[PDB]
Amino acid sequence: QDAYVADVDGILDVLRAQVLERKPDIFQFISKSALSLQKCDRINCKVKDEQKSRALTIIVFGASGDLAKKKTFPALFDLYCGGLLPPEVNIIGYARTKVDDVEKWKHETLMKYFSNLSERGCHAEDFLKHISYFCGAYDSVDDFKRLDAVIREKENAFKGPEKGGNRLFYLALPPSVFASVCESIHKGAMPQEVGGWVRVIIEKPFGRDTKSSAELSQALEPFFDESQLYRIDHYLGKEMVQNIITTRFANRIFSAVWNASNIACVQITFKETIGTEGRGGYFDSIGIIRDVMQNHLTQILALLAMEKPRSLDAECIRDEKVSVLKCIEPITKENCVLGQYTASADGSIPGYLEDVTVPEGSTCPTFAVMRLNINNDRWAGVPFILKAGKAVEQKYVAIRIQFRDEVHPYGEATQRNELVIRAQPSEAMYVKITTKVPGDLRQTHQTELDLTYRLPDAYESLINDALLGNSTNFVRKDELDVAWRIFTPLLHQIDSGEIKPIPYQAGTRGPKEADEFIANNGFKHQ
Amino acid sequence: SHADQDAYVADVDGILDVLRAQVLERIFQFISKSALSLQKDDRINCKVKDEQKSRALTIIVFGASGDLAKKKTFPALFDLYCGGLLPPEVNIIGYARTKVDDVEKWKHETLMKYFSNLSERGCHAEDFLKHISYFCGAYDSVDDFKRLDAVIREKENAFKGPEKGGNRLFYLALPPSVFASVCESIHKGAMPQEVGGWVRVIIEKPFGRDTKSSAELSQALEPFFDESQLYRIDHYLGKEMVQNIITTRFANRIFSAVWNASNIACVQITFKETIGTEGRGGYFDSIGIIRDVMQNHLTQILALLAMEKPRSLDAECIRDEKVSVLKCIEPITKENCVLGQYTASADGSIPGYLEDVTVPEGSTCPTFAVMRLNINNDRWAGVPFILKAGKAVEQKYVAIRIQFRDEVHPYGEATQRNELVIRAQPSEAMYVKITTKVPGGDLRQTHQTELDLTYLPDAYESLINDALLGNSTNFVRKDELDVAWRIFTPLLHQIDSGEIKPIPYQAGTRGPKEADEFIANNGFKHQ
Amino acid sequence: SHADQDAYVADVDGILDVLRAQVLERIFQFISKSALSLQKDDRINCKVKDEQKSRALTIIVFGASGDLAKKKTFPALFDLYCGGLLPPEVNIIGYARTKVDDVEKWKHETLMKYFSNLSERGCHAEDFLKHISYFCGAYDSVDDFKRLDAVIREKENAFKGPEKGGNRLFYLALPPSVFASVCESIHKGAMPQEVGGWVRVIIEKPFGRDTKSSAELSQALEPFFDESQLYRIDHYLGKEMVQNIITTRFANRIFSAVWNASNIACVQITFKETIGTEGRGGYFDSIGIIRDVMQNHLTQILALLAMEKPRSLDAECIRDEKVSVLKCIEPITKENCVLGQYTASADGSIPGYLEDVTVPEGSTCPTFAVMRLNINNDRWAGVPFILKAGKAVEQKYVAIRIQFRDEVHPYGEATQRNELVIRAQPSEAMYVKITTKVPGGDLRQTHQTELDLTYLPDAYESLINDALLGNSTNFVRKDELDVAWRIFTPLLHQIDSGEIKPIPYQAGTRGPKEADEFIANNGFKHQ
């Protein structure tokens, strides 16, 4: 083995490069990079006794679609491998296209997208056995009755104590067919009277403005109520929400500074390096604000800014999400800077307008910075900045709370404290403070305190949440309405051409004007 | 309301800053005019400073043959040398009454025995002695100090550097009874040359034993040396702890905003030793635990911890703040004080306090004290402050512990009181206890976690260093000292008048069970 | 401080060495455990290698009838043969589209005309042709490459040596537009046999003309060949100069310690030719002097000269270092660039650049460029780096010149700036200029002396050799190439957008007077 002399040398070569980049004050850095450089098992079932007590069926509508096959089904697979699905779980992919060989479909359409991880891949065949294919319409009651019978079949065979069955319907569909699917389920394939709940996950967009969103909510409410309805936002992780709620509400120190008299500004940032990737045509209808800001970032804001919930029960948290959103003034055009990406320097990302499926003269924003004003006692005069961008300089999602400076007495020997909650590209939560350096008090150091102590990922966390019936991280009907009332005037102004996106090059941070806007609305760089 | 007090201070400071920004471009009457108008809208690496190596320096250790000087002061100067913080042309003169013949054998047999043997310093011992002279004199003869003056000028004019004259630190490693005469002596004829040089005088505890005694000494010294020159030293107050107290709080909005009645449930400052007093009733019995470390050591720590915000980090600004907060403290009452005196350890290895030839039989002198102070101001009213000191207890510990109020809602028993600890002994440590989420998934599944806020000459050494650098922060000012004595003297009288009595406790225990009951009855909740 | 950076690297490297010394006696987790614990303390003489003559080798020169291949590549392989650095069983196949009948007349009339006539090689010409075959094919038909594959295996299985299979160097002497298809073709069915053999592919400039164009090619080739296999060749970078740059510095404390901001006043890399472009506006006018030799040739020289210390002489370690330093370079600005275009010589023998049928009338294309780069890192911040390239100038020269800061004190005008020169053209030379005493007797009587640090296939030939030996050092890696393009592309855009303009200079002069003013205004002092 003269290839043992080699591989360890490469290991060392990597450690070397890590330390010379970071430049620690070195033994301990090597120690904690060696362990980050490492970082046929039976599935132990981690499911509650209520979950194993009744049959479960999960029906994914749109099963051969890109969302369902690249995201939903792999997610369910991960949950299965993690023991978070009951042992006798039934999953049915429902789609409109006839399939000769369902077993081929399973291998070719689903297994292809399963995590090729060693400790996952060897469960794939066992997982496929829990999956059926079902071919039907999304609007024909008789097809749902035929579905109902296929399910009752599996339910009534359940090797377990309670009768009937729980049914989770995942609508991996365009919003245009939701009303008809829901009506079809109502009439055709609700759970057996003998026992079981019905839950329905629906995907964005939830309309594109107050009116359209309300119309869609009125179209669904006669069939499913807010205990049954689960408007999923894929990006909102369990781990970041615990960061937002526990760190603050369980602690006097953080509770006491979480307000107007101690906070200079709050910024919620969503950054990706990817562009639209050929699908510009679809995005051109939606734009960055509707895509992630009115939904994802606003739910983050809500959770960050809410008053204290009467309890940690899901609907109490949702009540407070609603109340704080109700205090937010509609965003004005003057508090909004738009961007539209041009080609990256290496051309790996063609310009947004180079996409043939984007119509000539498109003014669609791929980037947006804006300021929200929360008019209540806790937040009055505190700038909340939402920032979202495609084809910018890195992949990143974080909350940055910047606290007011203590001018006296440290002056320039201190700077504003920050609390950062990051979810991407990895989870971190930390406070920047100034501390002494180990004669003069004026000699100080900015330091970062880590507050953060294979778990499921954000999307998997939400599906698990829906299976356990925890509504916390899902936008409720009333919450949604209020969110649309924050953004809709701005969207009208943008659709009437009153704001124009500034071109930025893909791979850069975005328009210089967006950074100046942040610095003009209460943020200091230091 | 708590937020408005801090806001009022921050407004005033902001107004003064814009006056400052104007009145630094071309007089009292410009303040008033701008006021109306604002309304309308190995080898010693030398680390020493330039000024330090720019003029000559003589350190005179008076009483140089006494225990304090040879076992503490000179070894401490030795460490500053090794750590490269003495100027390279440093002159050091031990002054004392005994006449000596072989100066070099004195440096070796009286001084060197007590230097640091550690191998990182062993090398430097002989180097450091080249800087030391001996001088034989009394502490009252004007003659001797004129003789000293000539010897100093000899060494000063020999300095090979730009500025003339010489700076002089007079260190009185002496009994306080002689401070007044030595100081008058230095005034009459051993002050620095007219051409240039500061003078500074380090004096040693005790600084009296009550309000009256302490003020006599202050009146005695103040004709000769002012508060920019006098340095009343406390061996135990270290730089590292002082910075932890001031910086961590005042540089940071997060801590500053919670440093008050509205957020803090209770505060304890603790000084604990396993050692007793054996064979030192000679000093201790007259002094007691309260005068030994509580009136002087714990109270300066308190002052630094409780003070309002100083406008800058200038030393006298900080000291102004120490004085103002001390003035808000009610004189300690006998109703708020639990005393102890130690007896022999259960195991019978450590002898009791009274079991000592040098201790008056039947002595009532406390080796232990726990007390509650009330700070009557907007920031602190109602907040229990507990001072605790004890000899011959279970462990050697010195720490501040701040206990914050619970957020009962909505985590309940899934959370508990945040704390902040600043420890100096047995080692430096500063942390906050807070409650965090655990990954893997109910909101009420929580952990306690201690955040480490942490990012070298010892305490004593760094005080000598600050005095060389001309920094008064950690030294008790005349006014400050008076107020502290007024806080403690009435209780000390009630103690001498027998009105409260020490409870016995076996050496090696926590102390009197009543002390812990006292603490828990004064707002502290055990974690 | 400069000494501490180097010391930090040398410490880290020393720690990794003691880990290496341990972890070579019986796993990542042993690094962490050892980390905590370290803290607590005439005839062709065959010169070829054994591995080289141990398995079969086929060199396939694609585009074998093109000018590059017949006038350069094959004569270069011929010289390697004569110098005894081709394996003795070497198979060489020229591949091309024209069908040929008399293979032997092709070798003589298309190839041999251009071999070296020199009498030391004349003898070997016919010898070398026995190793050459012809193959007629296209660059996209999977068929032809399956046919080639069979022909190669024929020659490979016929090898009279120990190891089976055969190593294959594919040389694409082709226009870059066909690189992608030829590479896919080789992937689909002409890779080396499964049993054994490496594959390597030499590709020829241009490697795009900007960041975008270059990255397209990289993405195009990377599905089929990785960076251990691809060899982007630069005909002009010679072994002898590369070793002068790396060894002279990194093997020697004396040079290593002075290779930084604290010691170096300014650095110029110069590429100068007397020849012009006459009758080659066909390539040049689209390219310009900056893309021709500066983005590619001068910048690799810069990278090698400016890089931080690699942990070893392993090729990819050196390349890692080239990339890191290139990443520290600010994109060149139009404010830091002086351009020229040549006109007819004063004597009227050489015609101007625009005086050529193959050159767009009114062309603005630079034949000359001087520019300042800023390298923003601890080692180089503030140090002027000047790149200079020019066609039709006064002499044929290629050299690095490092100018060190004066020691003004105490020799004054009896000394001047030390320099280090590494010259490759018109001949190899490496020297330092320093100031020495003269014998016979004042200390200020001094001389300048040039110390000669000096102690064979040409540049191009030695690159083909390195590729046969599997050494990537002097070849631009994919990441490296991208960064270089990012340094030059924004300036190239400002040039194409007309924002700066070339100054005319008569062929045979130094170039534009403004260029020399520029240089002297960027830290260089004439000796």
PDB file of C-alpha atoms in Angstrom, chain A residues 238-239 241-243 245-247 249-257 261-262 308-312 317 403-410 413-415 417-418 427 429 431-445 447 449-453 470 472, chain B residues 3 13-14 17 239-240 242-244 246-248 250-258 262-263 309-314 318 404-407 409-411 415-416 418-419 428 432-444 446 449 451-453 455 466 473:
ATOM      1  CA  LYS A 238     -39.110  22.749  12.233  1.00  0.00           C
ATOM      2  CA  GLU A 239     -35.586  23.571  13.402  1.00  0.00           C
ATOM      3  CA  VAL A 241     -39.159  27.686  13.975  1.00  0.00           C
ATOM      4  CA  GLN A 242     -37.950  26.251  17.278  1.00  0.00           C
ATOM      5  CA  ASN A 243     -35.055  28.685  17.033  1.00  0.00           C
ATOM      6  CA  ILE A 245     -39.892  30.636  19.357  1.00  0.00           C
ATOM      7  CA  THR A 246     -37.927  28.919  22.152  1.00  0.00           C
ATOM      8  CA  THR A 247     -34.792  31.092  22.134  1.00  0.00           C
ATOM      9  CA  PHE A 249     -39.973  33.070  24.661  1.00  0.00           C
ATOM     10  CA  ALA A 250     -38.250  30.745  27.174  1.00  0.00           C
ATOM     11  CA  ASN A 251     -35.580  33.285  28.121  1.00  0.00           C
ATOM     12  CA  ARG A 252     -35.839  36.600  29.957  1.00  0.00           C
ATOM     13  CA  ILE A 253     -32.724  37.884  28.222  1.00  0.00           C
ATOM     14  CA  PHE A 254     -34.069  37.464  24.702  1.00  0.00           C
ATOM     15  CA  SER A 255     -37.698  38.283  25.566  1.00  0.00           C
ATOM     16  CA  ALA A 256     -36.602  41.593  27.055  1.00  0.00           C
ATOM     17  CA  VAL A 257     -34.687  42.846  23.981  1.00  0.00           C
ATOM     18  CA  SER A 261     -36.467  49.931  22.170  1.00  0.00           C
ATOM     19  CA  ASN A 262     -33.591  47.519  21.539  1.00  0.00           C
ATOM     20  CA  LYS A 308     -46.561  35.729  23.104  1.00  0.00           C
ATOM     21  CA  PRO A 309     -49.006  32.845  22.429  1.00  0.00           C
ATOM     22  CA  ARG A 310     -51.518  31.923  25.145  1.00  0.00           C
ATOM     23  CA  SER A 311     -49.914  28.469  24.846  1.00  0.00           C
ATOM     24  CA  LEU A 312     -47.568  26.475  22.596  1.00  0.00           C
ATOM     25  CA  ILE A 317     -49.383  30.212  17.603  1.00  0.00           C
ATOM     26  CA  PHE A 403     -29.777  45.589  17.935  1.00  0.00           C
ATOM     27  CA  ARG A 404     -29.316  49.309  18.634  1.00  0.00           C
ATOM     28  CA  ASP A 405     -25.754  50.447  19.234  1.00  0.00           C
ATOM     29  CA  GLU A 406     -24.374  51.487  22.616  1.00  0.00           C
ATOM     30  CA  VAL A 407     -22.612  54.706  21.542  1.00  0.00           C
ATOM     31  CA  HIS A 408     -21.438  55.430  25.097  1.00  0.00           C
ATOM     32  CA  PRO A 409     -19.060  54.515  26.487  1.00  0.00           C
ATOM     33  CA  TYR A 410     -17.183  52.149  24.137  1.00  0.00           C
ATOM     34  CA  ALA A 413     -14.635  50.017  20.342  1.00  0.00           C
ATOM     35  CA  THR A 414     -18.052  48.394  20.004  1.00  0.00           C
ATOM     36  CA  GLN A 415     -20.686  47.821  17.314  1.00  0.00           C
ATOM     37  CA  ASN A 417     -25.109  43.262  18.463  1.00  0.00           C
ATOM     38  CA  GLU A 418     -26.778  40.776  16.144  1.00  0.00           C
ATOM     39  CA  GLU A 427     -28.403  25.561  10.349  1.00  0.00           C
ATOM     40  CA  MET A 429     -27.997  30.426  15.403  1.00  0.00           C
ATOM     41  CA  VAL A 431     -25.186  36.260  18.789  1.00  0.00           C
ATOM     42  CA  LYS A 432     -22.453  38.713  17.875  1.00  0.00           C
ATOM     43  CA  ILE A 433     -21.378  40.692  20.947  1.00  0.00           C
ATOM     44  CA  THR A 434     -18.225  42.566  21.900  1.00  0.00           C
ATOM     45  CA  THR A 435     -16.060  41.086  24.642  1.00  0.00           C
ATOM     46  CA  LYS A 436     -12.754  42.051  26.227  1.00  0.00           C
ATOM     47  CA  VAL A 437      -9.486  40.736  24.780  1.00  0.00           C
ATOM     48  CA  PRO A 438      -7.180  38.881  27.257  1.00  0.00           C
ATOM     49  CA  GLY A 439      -4.692  46.307  29.630  1.00  0.00           C
ATOM     50  CA  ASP A 440      -7.159  48.805  28.126  1.00  0.00           C
ATOM     51  CA  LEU A 441     -10.954  48.437  28.239  1.00  0.00           C
ATOM     52  CA  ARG A 442     -10.909  50.015  24.739  1.00  0.00           C
ATOM     53  CA  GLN A 443      -9.299  46.805  23.463  1.00  0.00           C
ATOM     54  CA  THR A 444     -12.270  44.697  22.331  1.00  0.00           C
ATOM     55  CA  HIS A 445     -13.167  41.768  20.032  1.00  0.00           C
ATOM     56  CA  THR A 447     -17.166  37.325  18.993  1.00  0.00           C
ATOM     57  CA  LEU A 449     -21.696  32.712  20.545  1.00  0.00           C
ATOM     58  CA  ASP A 450     -23.123  29.509  19.083  1.00  0.00           C
ATOM     59  CA  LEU A 451     -26.595  29.058  20.671  1.00  0.00           C
ATOM     60  CA  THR A 452     -27.323  25.892  18.643  1.00  0.00           C
ATOM     61  CA  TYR A 453     -27.028  22.485  20.341  1.00  0.00           C
ATOM     62  CA  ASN A 470     -49.566  19.764  13.951  1.00  0.00           C
ATOM     63  CA  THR A 472     -48.161  25.306  13.446  1.00  0.00           C
TER      64      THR A 472
ATOM     65  CA  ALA B   3     -36.398  51.672  28.809  1.00  0.00           C
ATOM     66  CA  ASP B  13     -25.341  61.849  25.887  1.00  0.00           C
ATOM     67  CA  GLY B  14     -26.386  62.339  22.237  1.00  0.00           C
ATOM     68  CA  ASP B  17     -22.121  64.742  21.447  1.00  0.00           C
ATOM     69  CA  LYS B 239      -8.173  43.319  35.294  1.00  0.00           C
ATOM     70  CA  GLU B 240      -9.805  40.257  33.730  1.00  0.00           C
ATOM     71  CA  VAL B 242     -13.225  44.170  35.866  1.00  0.00           C
ATOM     72  CA  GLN B 243     -13.354  44.033  32.023  1.00  0.00           C
ATOM     73  CA  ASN B 244     -15.844  41.149  32.149  1.00  0.00           C
ATOM     74  CA  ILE B 246     -17.738  46.610  32.321  1.00  0.00           C
ATOM     75  CA  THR B 247     -17.322  45.488  28.672  1.00  0.00           C
ATOM     76  CA  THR B 248     -19.736  42.574  28.622  1.00  0.00           C
ATOM     77  CA  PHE B 250     -21.792  48.345  28.531  1.00  0.00           C
ATOM     78  CA  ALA B 251     -20.497  47.478  25.013  1.00  0.00           C
ATOM     79  CA  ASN B 252     -23.559  45.329  24.320  1.00  0.00           C
ATOM     80  CA  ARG B 253     -27.201  46.326  23.956  1.00  0.00           C
ATOM     81  CA  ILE B 254     -28.299  42.748  24.816  1.00  0.00           C
ATOM     82  CA  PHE B 255     -26.839  42.755  28.341  1.00  0.00           C
ATOM     83  CA  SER B 256     -27.210  46.500  29.007  1.00  0.00           C
ATOM     84  CA  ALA B 257     -30.972  46.395  28.489  1.00  0.00           C
ATOM     85  CA  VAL B 258     -31.462  43.563  31.029  1.00  0.00           C
ATOM     86  CA  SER B 262     -37.258  44.752  35.629  1.00  0.00           C
ATOM     87  CA  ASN B 263     -35.185  41.729  34.558  1.00  0.00           C
ATOM     88  CA  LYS B 309     -23.446  54.197  32.475  1.00  0.00           C
ATOM     89  CA  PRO B 310     -20.292  56.402  32.379  1.00  0.00           C
ATOM     90  CA  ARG B 311     -20.049  58.779  29.420  1.00  0.00           C
ATOM     91  CA  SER B 312     -16.641  57.337  28.533  1.00  0.00           C
ATOM     92  CA  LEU B 313     -14.008  54.842  29.650  1.00  0.00           C
ATOM     93  CA  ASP B 314     -11.909  57.595  31.222  1.00  0.00           C
ATOM     94  CA  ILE B 318     -15.902  55.299  35.896  1.00  0.00           C
ATOM     95  CA  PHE B 404     -32.793  36.773  36.022  1.00  0.00           C
ATOM     96  CA  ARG B 405     -36.571  36.558  36.449  1.00  0.00           C
ATOM     97  CA  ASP B 406     -38.361  33.506  35.046  1.00  0.00           C
ATOM     98  CA  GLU B 407     -40.451  33.659  31.924  1.00  0.00           C
ATOM     99  CA  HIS B 409     -45.305  31.922  30.233  1.00  0.00           C
ATOM    100  CA  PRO B 410     -45.481  30.001  27.996  1.00  0.00           C
ATOM    101  CA  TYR B 411     -42.779  27.339  28.575  1.00  0.00           C
ATOM    102  CA  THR B 415     -37.822  26.670  31.112  1.00  0.00           C
ATOM    103  CA  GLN B 416     -36.111  28.187  34.155  1.00  0.00           C
ATOM    104  CA  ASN B 418     -31.473  32.512  33.016  1.00  0.00           C
ATOM    105  CA  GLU B 419     -28.257  33.282  34.869  1.00  0.00           C
ATOM    106  CA  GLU B 428     -11.617  32.686  35.031  1.00  0.00           C
ATOM    107  CA  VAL B 432     -24.939  32.663  30.655  1.00  0.00           C
ATOM    108  CA  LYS B 433     -27.372  29.804  31.341  1.00  0.00           C
ATOM    109  CA  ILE B 434     -30.279  29.849  28.870  1.00  0.00           C
ATOM    110  CA  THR B 435     -32.884  27.388  27.620  1.00  0.00           C
ATOM    111  CA  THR B 436     -32.649  26.041  24.057  1.00  0.00           C
ATOM    112  CA  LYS B 437     -34.581  23.668  21.815  1.00  0.00           C
ATOM    113  CA  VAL B 438     -33.252  20.148  21.299  1.00  0.00           C
ATOM    114  CA  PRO B 439     -33.286  18.727  17.706  1.00  0.00           C
ATOM    115  CA  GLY B 440     -35.461  15.627  17.147  1.00  0.00           C
ATOM    116  CA  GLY B 441     -40.033  17.192  17.798  1.00  0.00           C
ATOM    117  CA  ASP B 442     -42.087  19.059  20.410  1.00  0.00           C
ATOM    118  CA  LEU B 443     -41.631  22.757  21.287  1.00  0.00           C
ATOM    119  CA  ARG B 444     -41.505  21.977  25.041  1.00  0.00           C
ATOM    120  CA  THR B 446     -35.789  21.879  25.954  1.00  0.00           C
ATOM    121  CA  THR B 449     -27.113  25.340  27.940  1.00  0.00           C
ATOM    122  CA  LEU B 451     -22.939  29.906  26.722  1.00  0.00           C
ATOM    123  CA  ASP B 452     -19.247  30.726  27.173  1.00  0.00           C
ATOM    124  CA  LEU B 453     -18.733  34.517  26.748  1.00  0.00           C
ATOM    125  CA  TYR B 455     -12.703  34.898  24.142  1.00  0.00           C
ATOM    126  CA  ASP B 466      -2.268  50.060  35.775  1.00  0.00           C
ATOM    127  CA  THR B 473     -10.098  52.622  37.523  1.00  0.00           C
TER     128      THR B 473
END
